[PDB]
Design a protein around this ligand. Sequence first.
Ligand SMILES: [Mg+2]
Ligand SMILES: [Mg+2]
Ligand SMILES: [Mg+2]
Ligand SMILES: [Mg+2]
Ligand SMILES: [Mg+2]
Ligand SMILES: [Mg+2]
Ligand SMILES: [Mg+2]
Ligand SMILES: [Mg+2]
Ligand SMILES: [Mg+2]
Lengths: 170, 293, 159, 205
Amino acid sequence: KENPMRELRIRKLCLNICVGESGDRLTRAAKVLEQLTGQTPVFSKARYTVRSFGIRRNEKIAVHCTVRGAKAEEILEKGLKVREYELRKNNFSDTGNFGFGIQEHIDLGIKYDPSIGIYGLDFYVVLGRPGFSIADKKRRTGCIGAKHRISKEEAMRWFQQKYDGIILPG
Amino acid sequence: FVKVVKNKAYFKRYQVKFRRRREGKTDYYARKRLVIQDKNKYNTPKYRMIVRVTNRDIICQIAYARIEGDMIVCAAYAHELPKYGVKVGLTNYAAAYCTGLLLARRLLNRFGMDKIYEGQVEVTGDEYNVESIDGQPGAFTCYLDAGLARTTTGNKVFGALKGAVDGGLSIPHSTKRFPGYDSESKEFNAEVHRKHIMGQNVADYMRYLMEEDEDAYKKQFSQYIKNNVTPDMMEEMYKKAHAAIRENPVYEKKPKREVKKKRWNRPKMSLAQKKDRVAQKKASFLRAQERAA
Amino acid sequence: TNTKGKRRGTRYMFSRPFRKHGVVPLATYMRIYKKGDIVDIKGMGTVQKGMPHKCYHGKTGRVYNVTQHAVGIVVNKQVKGKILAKRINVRIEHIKHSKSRDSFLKRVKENDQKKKEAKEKGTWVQLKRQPAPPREAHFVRTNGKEPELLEPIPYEFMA
Amino acid sequence: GRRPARCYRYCKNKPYPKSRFCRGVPDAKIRIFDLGRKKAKVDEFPLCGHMVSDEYEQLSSEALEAARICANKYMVKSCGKDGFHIRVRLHPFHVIRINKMLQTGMRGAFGKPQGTVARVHIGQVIMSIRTKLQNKEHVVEALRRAKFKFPGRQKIHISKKWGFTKFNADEFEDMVAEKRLIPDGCGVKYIPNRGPLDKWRALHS
RNA sequence: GUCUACGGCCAUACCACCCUGAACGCGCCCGAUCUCGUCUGAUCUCGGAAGCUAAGCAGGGUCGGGCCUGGUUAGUACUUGGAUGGGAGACCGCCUGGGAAUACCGGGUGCUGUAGGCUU
RNA sequence: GGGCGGUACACCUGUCAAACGGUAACGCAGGUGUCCUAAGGCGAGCUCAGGGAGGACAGAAACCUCCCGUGGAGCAGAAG
RNA sequence: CAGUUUUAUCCGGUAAAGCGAAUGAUUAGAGGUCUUGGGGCCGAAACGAUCUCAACCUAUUCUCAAACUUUAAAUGGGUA
Ligand SMILES: [Mg+2]
Ligand SMILES: [Mg+2]
Ligand SMILES: [Mg+2]
Ligand SMILES: [Mg+2]
Ligand SMILES: [Mg+2]
Ligand SMILES: [Mg+2]
Ligand SMILES: [Mg+2]
Ligand SMILES: [Mg+2]
Ligand SMILES: [Mg+2]
């Protein structure tokens, strides 16, 4: 017995593209995520103005999105399809999450268009067990318990158990 | 290599909060407005009307406040319904209005104001702010106290509100968050509210679940069909709530058979045993130490 | 030439006690205050509305007025030689009861209990409080041993 | 030099430390507060001779420099070059003031900082030397000379402790022996019977 | 022994790691037609009930930290009054009466004044 | 002493103030003669600085995500 | 009625004390992995190995405070 409320599923899947420039670069990099998921993305903006980069305070820069459910497994298969299933040791966080960023969005299966270009983006997977929306509901918050929290090795033998993804030392 | 932030000098300068905020059941900033009486009133109590939502149950209580903790006068649970003949879908809007009615005429059957101050008998949906009667003993009022549930537009709490009001209680309200409010043009219908009261939105599943598929009609209607309830039995009970079974409002709390008084919780390990454990562990570690090496 | 502000020299006075910051507890408010009761005054830094001036922090007076969220109060003050009888309007947070009158209201009742009783008995029971008299002659028994001889210590440099 | 030390000798004013308020302060001359082979163990310098002050006064830090030097030059001769350990157990924090009369005059005469100084109570340690037990008759001689730089009157006292600790003479070896105290270079740590058990097992095993 | 709304300064009630949890209960959990909302039915809102002990939950545990009270430090430090009492001065003794605080060593780890349903 | 030089000539904040309050000097360290249709008045909803572990160009420092997080941030200006 | 005392009651942050407690100032060693460097050093590289000086974390230690404080007296201030 493994107490069926001890599985390992996906809570959420994150995505962002940071370009560091407003105008047309941002609003054209907002059509890759829309084709990619099916929903509208959310612009982020600056925090404090830096004289060297070329950003101003509260100037719009990046674009990010959040994915749920059975939609994340599909995009994550096009991911580990791209990375040919050879992640490494230090991609895994100490709390139980990983992430990685692809170099070009041609690998996601999207056809090139010459008024766009290529924008590099990022993936970040967030794991889960039943009871995790305890630490966010308004009424009776409570916390987890720390017999029920995920380590680094359990996640690595979930990735290796599921997608047969090898992990190399390095 | 980073500094531990839960030091001795973190626990020394750490004032704890209140117990009901640590157990997060309450709000003291929302209570302080609701509960105090103005000082020129001199021990005139301030009635509030608690409504609690639980994932299988509804609770409707009435209480003023004292320094010894706020004190109940009249409680109304939502699992005393299957006395009367509503057994399934115990927590919908319908039973939220049926409980507030059972509370209402319970209190009127504990004060002696039954025949006077009837309230609404029919079920229409419009404003029935109950006015007082001259010469007779005056009306009864009680202010609402919802709590930690966002009172948006369409909550089950207000069904209990409309039930205690139409029962006869005089509660201040305004028809802006009731099922039937148009957020673009600001008018209000009654029949949409009475379509939401008796159980017609609950009923419509006798189509969207009874036709399109038949496998999910047994995946999520497994207690209507067990108790043999069709989707046309959306029926009146309120003459049974009205008539005479508030002469047992309390159900006559049942007598108590004498219990064995047996215990199910292992008691506290004493001092002269915690002073004995570490003598066992020091002698076991020295007799499993010097023997080995 | 110091200043004449409202809150001069009240760094430590309107401050909250240590580890007692935060929310005002709810049994401060719902206590009842009649007219005629005797009240001491303690300031507070949370609710800035209705503070007393800094020269009343500790005085004690009685009530003459009750309001919606405040009571009027009559106190006494000493200005350059004379004594003025002045009245204020104080919110509830800055106010407590005084327990000074209570051991008198427990001794009026105890005396009238000690008087209604044993008057019909023709008994003469003492009523006046009498101060601590000089104590009585009494024996001390040293069963057996002798008193323990003390010795003043010889000096040595401790440090 | 500056004004002689007859002026700033009695503790008179309130303490006026270098802070957010008093800037414009020159630095003290003393910068090293101990010397010798300070990389010592607590098991090879048993002796500990103090210099107890007596009178409530102020000691300048140029005296806390020209006393350290005069005790070092004699200690290199007699006891050797690695047979001792000197500490100076004060730190000058109080700041003393001055007024320059260069025609304005006496109006507006709040002073400027001149130097630094250290307050001294009665029965307070100034200097302390720990050394081997064989060299006791050369520390009275070193401090008899250090007495000619400070003003006032103070006394030389041989402690009843062991080294620079707060523990007694004989008690120290029976307690180290029953593993209550642990050597840590110049000091020692105390083990109570209060903490949890795994340190106990990490001490016995 | 539990659920609802609390009281008092709100820690004897907190934090960290372990463990057992009978019955009624609370909860994670099943889902998106119902004008409840979000980029996202996760959160909020609603309609529900196949399935199970991590849960601010509940109770006990740690030669635990923390806290709460008691001894030591100590009649020490300090101090209201007084003296043709010392001392070159700094400052220290005396009579008279009041009188602390750390380190260090011990014991305790929620009472429930509380009203309604409930180990019954 | 006058003069040249200053504002202690109306106000507020800490300190001197000798454990209520009051209390001086050309005694200290400092500031003001304004600013705002929101930075005023109600209501819902959120929680900050810093720190860790990660992630394509990304570096000391852009954005995202997870955990610890009794105020270490902020509240137009001086300081409580 | 009182320039006073007793018995009950609340108020105050001074002298003392304290940094192994916050806010600031400060000396010397001890164990660690490098948390990062400037150089030795073998090195086509390293947190491999490095002497380390050094900062970093943990337990310890020497002294301080008018504009710093956990505690906290003596006299003293109102009431009955
Ligand atoms: Mg838990
Ligand atoms: Mg466990
Ligand atoms: Mg002076
Ligand atoms: Mg209980
Ligand atoms: Mg049984
Ligand atoms: Mg403990
Ligand atoms: Mg005074
Ligand atoms: Mg503002
Ligand atoms: Mg001081």
